[PDB]
Symmetry: C5
């Protein structure tokens, strides 16, 4: 694609939506939570249940039909419902005798991307002998080299509630037509730090002034917002996730 | 709807006030504190008492009346340009001698610490809220305004839960956030820091100004010559000698500079 | 005053000094420390001893006398333009080898840590204070200047509690903050870092300058040719072998550059 | 070398690759992990096994042959740690953080380091303990003395072999490395949380204060990395270093020089 | 001094060196470490062993002889802590963090400090405890009173000797040092983790707000450092300060001055 001039004047459109989190939803009451975590006694017996595995969120958003391509230029984003983590009274584990419940805390992954095609993924496994469950899409034909880098494990984020967070990352060797951003903060005691504001804009243009170009007039939004773990009275722990807001401004760009 | 020129020359005004916190105030002695926190026996039976729930603070400030004479196709509106804001009384959290829980044998009292939410907004109309529930089966108490007709989808995003921050001491902090799909005429800023051992970090200065203009150079436009200020400043929890814990909040200072803007109807 | 031009060409002067901390000084050996903290048996019986309460530091520095001759409609005032400031003696906190509680079996002494308040201001008049009480039923001791006629409102915001920082070793840190509704002719800066285990982080350099000019390019204007410097540097608590804890403070260095400004009075 | 003009137009090339971590690989199932850490009874008896010692990673990348000569000049770097989300596996023979809890995540001491140069990274040896016996198959500071615990200028080496130079023995030599750009952070402590950022939007410029990047001697580019993310604690309490791969994309341009 | 024009053209020189740390060196095997830290029962009985007290490091570096006179002006600094990766040795006579765990890494109170001046660093004495008896072989605040715990203006000195000025009783005097640039950070706490960054891409400019750097009196450059990284905990629980060397590269230029 040779990228030519931006159209001016009906030349702009805006996408506004939320992506709900996919933490595992172990029953009809627990949308936004995983199953409580259980630990294998060996690497060879690691066999996580599907409802215990957070997955990447993805939305494919149809744009007004053009034939010109829609170019994504700016992003406003934030995590929705941050104050829900102040619920320290719902059968949690008292931090000490007569105390409030331990708040959601521990390992977090906050990730979002905007692209003109599916996010491209590279698989990396903590433990190559993990048995990933039916109904997930995971690195296949894993070897011990999969624990550091096995170039066989290439995939597209092309299905919601399917690609487990722990076995996939954005492929840095691809994603020319996507902008992605993420932070992993690890540790059982890590405090959530979540900022909200409607005054912050991210520019999606690359060093040549070109944003993601939407193939087939489709915009791809992807997210993970694992906020940490909720600790039950019993000590059992569940991942807790929150929805992500996206507002994307697009303009019409001529290409050859 | 169409923004035209700024008026120069009585063309500017200043709002200066403080918003007190609404932490629950469980008796006549405990303004600025919640009731001690109680944990439900089951997840399903979560039922927080009203005086255990911090709520959003809101003030609506009347500005000098504009458009006292018939005008033709145009009006003036106050436009909020700048904000100075500060948490008031940060040093009160150095009181570690008032029947708190010693950090160790013969030690000082554990200071206020743990989960905090520091939030402020300036708008030309009420802050628009979206409801998100930690637990959709929580029973919220009489006297609060909370997400109604809650479903399991309320735990992640139920678009039915839309509200306006239009009553003080009513909207629980844990139920509601700014609605990012609205609030075109408000500027809002907040930080949640979660964890029982989180240390308060509170900065004060009279030298810091926030500009409220959007990317087109337009600040909030005050409908009916009213300015809406909203805040939450849950600083953490105070731990009593017994181990019981209460939220502790502080007041927020606002100084807003406004100018007269002509707009086309 | 209406501010006119800067005088050029003895048109500039410098103030250099240090303010000692006022942590309570409980005996002839314990300058820079408080009395050990004791916790009241009930919340209502809070009654801290004077030597247990850190206080704000203040110095009023006379400047070269201006306006010795009769002037007509105008005077000169010293205008404070820049500040360099530093906490003095940060390395003293490396003394973990005396009178302390071992971090663990055979370990070094626990260092000074926990709640800190680092605050400084430069003004052309006394720092204006607003009182906020953690507990309105606290009995503040004789020899301190504290919020009087306290009510439950005093726990969040009682506008009766207005004072000037006009006495050393008198205004307890925990009772008072800079009044954000005043202080037009002062620049103030402070950080409260709460929590019992928070680690001191103290930077020193002679390369950092703070500019004291407001958004109109005007610094504090010194009424009667007096400069007011104020500080708090509560670094945290020292822990004795017994577990008893004492606040520890350090001195603050100020270097202020001033210039003569003509004003219409 | 006198550095003259940049060529314009065929004048650019790109290197894209990844460097795998070299954490010790103690068995056929534990690529990316070290051996469990064991502690010596005395300073005198410190004798770490080779599979317990993370090493520097290095790649020598041949560039298109160019030959007053032309040299490839490295101008920009994009870099990323690959597989940050793998650290969310808290269910694979980890130590529960409390009764009925999830497994302890990887945490504690980390070293994240990368360099781009026109020749091998130059190393200086510094030893925690000069009486440590380093194992066969590693390249370590030789003829160590007590001064090796602070600065022994005898300990000079080139990062010229993969899986060989232990991280704990060697640092970039700040007295050399004029033709390399290096960047590293040590975060020390047993409970330190990993903080790992990923984005494809971040570029590092490799030009010095004279506008000159690394110049590739013999048309070879040198990439080096360490990404020790922390320690994995298994159900027994034993701890292993865990590393991840690093992505590099380098843009180069032809520069004329007089040699 | 009236400061006139910078010379251009033979007009520049560079100083490159390292300063070793002086942590106390309690035996012939423990260069870079202090003696184990003990706790006196009272402020009155505080009598630290010389070998337990880290000291400031200083080097006086002669510059090319120059002689209105010319003076060398220090313009830029690159600096680095040398050997940061040595702190990854958690296998040498350490105290396991928990059953079967690795050694507790170096952590706790750190002081990282450096200065570049045209004359000795000017010091001000501040005592934690005015009753501390400083040992023979150290230079310490004399005639101490209880006011020495906050500010006693009698305690003025120059950093004019190695292995002499204990870190804990001296700081740079902010009321002097007009001809020095100094930078330091004290990070307190029992368990604070080291955070140490290395790069050869970072330059500090030493010019003041008038565009003037340190002017070297008698053609001598003064470099000072402290890099107490934290404490090493032994298997017994006993703790020792651990220090590392600091690299300095200073660029200087000739400046004409009057008087
Ligand atoms: C947020 C939340 O739902 N917390 C629950 C968790 C989670 O639902 C679960 O861990 C997610 O995977 O479950 C807790 O335990 C309950 C769970 O094991 C259920 C499963 O049916 O059984 C409950 O005990 C039953 C018991 O099995 C019956 O024999 C008995 O007649 O009734 C008991 C009470 O219903 C467990 O309490 C958990 O701690 O993991 C409870 C949390 O509140």
């Amino acid at each position: 694609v040779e990228v030519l001039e931006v159209k001016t004047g009906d030349s702009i459109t805006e996408v506004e939506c939320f992506l709900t989190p996919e933490m595992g939803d172990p029953d009809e009451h627990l949308r936004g939570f995983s199953k409580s975590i259980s630990i294998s006694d060996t690497f060879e017996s690691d066999s996580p249940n599907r409802d215990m595995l957070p997955c990447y969120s993805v939305a494919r958003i149809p744009l007004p039909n053009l034939n010109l391509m829609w170019e994504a230029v700016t992003l406003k984003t934030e995590v929705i419902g941050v104050t829900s983590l102040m619920n320290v009274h719902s059968n949690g584990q008292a931090t000490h005798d007569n105390g409030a419940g331990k708040p959601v805390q521990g390992t977090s992954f906050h990730f979002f991307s905007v692209g003109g095609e599916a996010l491209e993924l590279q698989g990396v496994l903590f433990n190559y002998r993990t048995k990933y469950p039916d109904g997930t899409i995971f690195p296949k034909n894993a070897t011990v080299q999969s624990q550091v880098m096995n170039t066989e494990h290439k995939a597209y984020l092309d299905k919601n509630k399917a690609y487990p967070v722990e076995c996939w990352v954005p492929d840095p060797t691809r994603n020319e037509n996507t902008r992605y951003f993420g932070t992993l903060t690890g540790g059982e005691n890590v405090p959530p730090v979540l900022h909200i504001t409607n005054t912050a804009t991210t520019v999606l243009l690359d060093e040549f002034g070109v944003g993601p170009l939407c193939k087939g007039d489709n915009l791809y939004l992807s997210a993970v917002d694992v906020c940490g773990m909720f600790t039950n009275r019993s000590g059992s722990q569940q991942w807790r996730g929150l929805s992500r807001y996206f507002k994307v401004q697009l303009r019409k760009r001529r290409v050859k």
